[PDB]
Amino acid sequence: ARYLGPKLKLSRREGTDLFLKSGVRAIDTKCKIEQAPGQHGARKPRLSDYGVQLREKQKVRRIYGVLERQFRNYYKEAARLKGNTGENLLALLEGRLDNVVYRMGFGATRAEARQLVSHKAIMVNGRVVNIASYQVSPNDVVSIREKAKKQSRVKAALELAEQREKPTWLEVDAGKMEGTFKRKPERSDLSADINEHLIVELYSK
Amino acid sequence: LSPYLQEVAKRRTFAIISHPDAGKTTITEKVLLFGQAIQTAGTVKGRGSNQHAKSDWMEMEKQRGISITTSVMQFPYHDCLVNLLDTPGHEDFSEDTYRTLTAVDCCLMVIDAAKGVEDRTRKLMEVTRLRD
Amino acid sequence: NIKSAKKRAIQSEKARKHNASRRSMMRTFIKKVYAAIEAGDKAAAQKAFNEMQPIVDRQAAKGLIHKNKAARHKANLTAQINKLA
Amino acid sequence: MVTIRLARHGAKKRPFYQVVVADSRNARNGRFIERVGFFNPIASEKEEGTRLDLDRIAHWVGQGATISDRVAALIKEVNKAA
Amino acid sequence: DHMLDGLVEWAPAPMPRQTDTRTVEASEDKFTGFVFKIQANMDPKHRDRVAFMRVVSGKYEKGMKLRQVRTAKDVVISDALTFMAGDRSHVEEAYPGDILGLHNHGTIQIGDTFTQGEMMKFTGIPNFAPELFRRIRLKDPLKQKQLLKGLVQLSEEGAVQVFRPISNNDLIVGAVGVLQFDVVVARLKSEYNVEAVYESVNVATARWVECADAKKFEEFKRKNESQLALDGGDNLAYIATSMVNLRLAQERYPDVQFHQTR
Amino acid sequence: ATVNQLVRKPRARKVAKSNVPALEACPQKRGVCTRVYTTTPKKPNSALRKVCRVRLTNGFEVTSYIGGEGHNLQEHSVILIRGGRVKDLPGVRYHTVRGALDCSGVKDRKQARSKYGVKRPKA
RNA sequence: GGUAGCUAAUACCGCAUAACGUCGCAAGACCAAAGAGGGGGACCUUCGGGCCUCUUGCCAUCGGAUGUGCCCAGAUGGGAUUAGCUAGUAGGUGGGGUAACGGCUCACCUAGGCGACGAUCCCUAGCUGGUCUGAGAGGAUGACCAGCCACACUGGAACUGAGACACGGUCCAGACUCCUACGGGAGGCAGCAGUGGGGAAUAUUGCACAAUGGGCGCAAGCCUGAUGCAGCCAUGCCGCGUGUAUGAAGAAGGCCUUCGGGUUGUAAAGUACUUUCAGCGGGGAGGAAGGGAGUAAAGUUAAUACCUUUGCUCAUUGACGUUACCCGCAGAAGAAGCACCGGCUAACUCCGUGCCAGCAGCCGCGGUAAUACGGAGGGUGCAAGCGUUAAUCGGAAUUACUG
């Protein structure tokens, strides 16, 4: 129920970096990035109003590791939710515990930020959270499992982490390994090559 | 002579074997009227002795041709409680008969006095001595 | 049908018979009062009516001519018996 | 016989009864007259666990109405006025 | 009647049966039967099967709890047949030497020992392997279960046993000796209104029905799968063309028998 | 037009007609298969399309298409028909499911085997 | 089962007794019922137990609550290639009836009564809450769940009782079937599970009343396929995992190349790393409240008895259960497929092929170099699923009230 394959092959189709092969040397490249997402990558994809609309979400999914059968519901969710359903879907996409993990540098990739939330190596205001889908409310504080604390991996992660853009709605630590959900991410403090409406539409047809 | 070891000792569970068309099934039907299970009697293929009374060849095809697979019986004779088997005669056909011998402590062989000892008669003794 | 409560059957029959007569006595008596009417014996009328008055009330309290049913009988009777006599 | 009882409206293993005035004869979750509180056999040491319109229960008992024996174990395990 | 007088007079009370544990005296208590047969079950309103059990020791009583030694699962008994002459009868309670009937639902086989607890199995019961031929391909142009159902119901019995390859159709049956006729006849008696005929089939073996450790098997269930079958009872088997092609198959190696088990 | 008119003779919906009426309007059906022929399609195309006239279970007898290169079918058989027409052969409003009941899947097909019914050959 | 005879009760039945009851304007008429337990000082009498007493039980009148009758109106499918329908029919009066009004019934009497806002007659159909779809108005539907209704082999009938016209009651008829010593008998799974049959297709002849609820019972307790669990099936909706990192001018192999190379490809390898979920081992919540044993209560009483009540003492109560859950053990070990790539529609080539073979939802592909056929490479979209067929609403402002 996860990708499990040529992850760059992906970011090459999106022509952008999806934060996939994060790890050590952040800021991708080195793989052919761009000129060949397949066997005809060289080509000039003059795509349709559809393309520049599916590819938009087909991205958002990947830039988080989420899937369809489930992504939809997120949208349906945001829909019921008052306000720009566009930013809302984002608000819920960011609100993912598998995300708050990675985002708080407690793990390299948003992929490496799962194998643990899955293998019970994290938790909230107590109870260890097994589902890489938990929806983190406000205040809700995580904390790498006091158990397998700082190990032959997670340490090397925090390194590049705090040297990255750095969030604004979380009050992470470092050795105490236990961030917090200060507040729900506004629209102004997050974005890039990501359009709301362009995806809020695909599900309106 | 407690009500347990008494029931055990008064029991007796046996086979009836022979070569195809010897008398198994008939002697069986007759053993059944000596046990007050059949108030009349019959024959085989429902034949020469009339009346829709054949019988006690279970099945169906049996009553069309002649005998197929072990029918089993329990009746009282004299001071005992007999458990009676009815073992099919035919090479290819059984099997079964052999496995049925595993349930008997002893065994009765019918022989066609018009034929003497036939083939599966000889083969059945071999199987018998397996268990003395 | 093989269900213990079948004795509810023979149990009913008993009361069926019983009631039947009780009830059969009920009317048979009421009738006598009507016979007097289709005749004109105001004297024998109030007579049969009195020898019924309680006989009807009884099988009532017992539960066969339940409440009101009682009233009606005597009611429309005491009404006709004098309406023309 | 209007008996005040509980219906099992929980979910596999995690029940959730509901005190209700109902004609003794009906089915468990069958027709009833009026919910009058509930009963949570889970809850776990937190805030709630049971609720009952005690000053309503009385109105029924008032018109004669037998109470379940498991319903009675609630009418008091939660006191009466203290 | 003399031979009967002779029968009563001389012939043994229930005898001891041997096991891989001990000489089992008939005198003992603690129930100990062993099946031995799952008769050609027609049978007037059921698949029944009703396995025929011998009762070596102990007294059976209707509500008692027993242990199927083979599957190592404890089983409670209720409907336990007593056969009043080719006829089911309800049902009583039994003593050593009698013959009791049960109710096979893929739980009973042949030689399945039943105790009250003692984990042991009777060393008796023959169980040999079939020869072959066949391909019942049916008139009645189908259905299809009733034929198949008929076949996967005459097969938890000991006589024959079917073989259904991985091509849905192509039904193979194998094969007591050569009396493949009761099949045809029970194909239009018992409770199946089918008809059915035969052919010749490129199968010498028989086969022999395999299983052991994983992965290796999945490489086996793949390479020579052409070629591989599956039975009524949901496992397992091969089906070969000759003896040489049988040897090479096993020779793929080294994972297990032989296996017949009826 | 007018309300009064609509009030009177009210507007009447126009029911739909299932292009495939081999009864029950149900998934698929079992059929004895009366004959196994091959025909020619409309003007533009020119093949030797394979078809079978099947006696369904509900009594309706109908002609069905046999998709894929080759089949085991013949005389009797017992296919199970599906749906979807064959705009090239008129009258052929049904497709017999491949690799179902007495029908053998297309031999060797490796692509889109879900249809033409075939099993993964040595992964 | 038949005949005879004895025997008890809260079985049955008089008599007595009567109002706040029934009948009657009133006078007066007339109506009822059962006892049985645990005790226990006097006295104790024909020392059975009388009696004192609490405890459940019975009669009667008026009420409470619930439950059920019954009545009126509006609405509740299609068909006029259905336009007329009806005599107890419509009303009256008067007897009878019912628990009750009532044509319910009967007698007599007026002659009516319904109907194109669609009667009647056919065809179809369990109705509502709701369910699916839709921006909505609507369209479709009424499995699971709850309310109302109806039926319980077919047809009919009554009986018992507070209530049945009675799924596991009775009587009759019918069809069917089963047992018989042959004279006569017996039964109806649309309760649970199960077999046959039919079908594209629909589950185990399981466990326990431990919990909630029902019947009886003073109570304990008994009964309870109701219920609660379990077994089968990806049928589905919500989860989750089959690995996470790091990695070369980028292996061999495959496939394409105008051969200069490109690409599957970080993909694999290799290097680190994590082991949820399975598998093995342990430890172990909650669903239990209660009832069953003793001590106290201006609790009533003649009473420390007996009975209830409330604290308190001990022993104790589960089917599911190798539970849910928690901790280790081991190791990426044990877990990916299906559809699609001419357009709508995201996604390309080679080879074969030759209007053959075949594709196709619509247009439309194939008669030698086909991105539409089959295969291969590659790519695209979904994922324990994917596809197809089927069905409904949408798009369909393509019955348009909104429109």
The alpha carbon of residue B126 and the mean position of all alpha carbons in its chain are separated, in whole angstroms, by 19
In terms of DSSP H, where are the helices of A81-191?
85-94, 97-103, 115-118, 154-161
Cβ contact, residue pair E12, B78, below 8 Å: no
The region, left, alpha or beta by phi > 0 then psi within -120 to 50, assigned to residue E140 is left
| F1-123: CATH superfamily | Nucleic acid-binding proteins (2.40.50.140)
With beta carbons less than 8 A apart as the criterion, state whether F96 and F66 touch.
yes
- Token readout for D40 is 């949570």
Contacts of residue E14, defined as CB under 8 A and 6 or more positions apart, other chains included, come to: B8, B11, B13, B105, E26, E55, E56, E96, E97
Say how far apart CA E39 and CA B86 lie, in whole Å.
Answer: 12
User: Is domain C1-85 given the CATH code 1.20.58.110 in the classification?
Assistant: yes
Bases along strand G below 7 A from a protein CB: 12-15, 21-24, 29-33, 59-61, 64-67, 79, 95-100, 139-140, 145-148, 159-162, 166, 168-170, 181, 186-188, 194-201, 204-207, 211-215, 226-230, 238-248, 250, 262-267, 272-277, 286-291, 311, 326-328, 332, 334-340, 344-349, 355-366, 374-393, 399-401
- What pairs with residue F30 in β-bridges? F80
With beta carbons less than 8 A apart as the criterion, state whether A121 and A144 touch.
yes
Say how far apart CA A76 and CA D29 lie, in whole Å.
Answer: 34
Say how far apart CA F102 and CA E37 lie, in whole Å.
Answer: 35
Judge whether A121 lies within some domain: yes
Contacts of residue F41, defined as CB under 8 A and 6 or more positions apart, other chains included, come to: F47, F49, F88, F89
Q: Is the dihedral of CA A91, A93, A96, A101 positive or negative?
A: negative
3-state secondary structure of E100: strand
Say how far apart CA C35 and CA C37 lie, in whole Å.
Answer: 5
The reply to whether A194 and A166 lie within a common domain is no
Segment A144-152 long-range contacts (CB within 8 Å, at least 24 positions apart): A144/A106, A144/A177, A144/A178, A145/A120, A145/A121, A147/A121, A148/A121, A149/A177, A150/A175, A150/A177
With beta carbons less than 8 A apart as the criterion, state whether F57 and F31 touch.
yes
In this complex, which chains have at least 3 CB pairs below 8 Å with chain C? none
Say how far apart CA A91 and CA A74 lie, in whole Å.
Answer: 10
With beta carbons less than 8 A apart as the criterion, state whether E100 and E84 touch.
no
The reply to whether A58 and A107 lie within a common domain is no
Judge whether A78 lies within some domain: yes
Looking up tokens 């229960």 gives D57
Binding site listing of B for GTP: 18-25, 86-90
Cβ contact, residue pair B68, E59, below 8 Å: no
With beta carbons less than 8 A apart as the criterion, state whether E131 and E204 touch.
no
Q: What is the CATH number of the domain that holds A159?
A: 3.10.290.10
- What pairs with residue B11 in β-bridges? B81
Query: Residue type at E137?
Result: R
Say how far apart CA C79 and CA C81 lie, in whole Å.
Answer: 6
Residue B16, CB-side half-sphere exposure with 13 Å CA sphere: 27
The reply to whether A111 and A88 lie within a common domain is no
Enter the resolution in angstroms: 3.1
Cβ contact, residue pair F102, E166, below 8 Å: no
Which sequence spans correspond to the domains of chain F?
1-123
Phi, psi at E230, each rounded to 5°: -155, 145
Query: Residue type at E83?
Result: F
With beta carbons less than 8 A apart as the criterion, state whether E172 and E166 touch.
no
In terms of DSSP H, where are the helices of E58-189?
181-187
- What pairs with residue D52 in β-bridges? D37
In angstroms, the CA of A90 and the C1' of G403 are apart by 38
The reply to whether A109 and A85 lie within a common domain is no
Say how far apart CA F80 and CA F96 lie, in whole Å.
Answer: 6
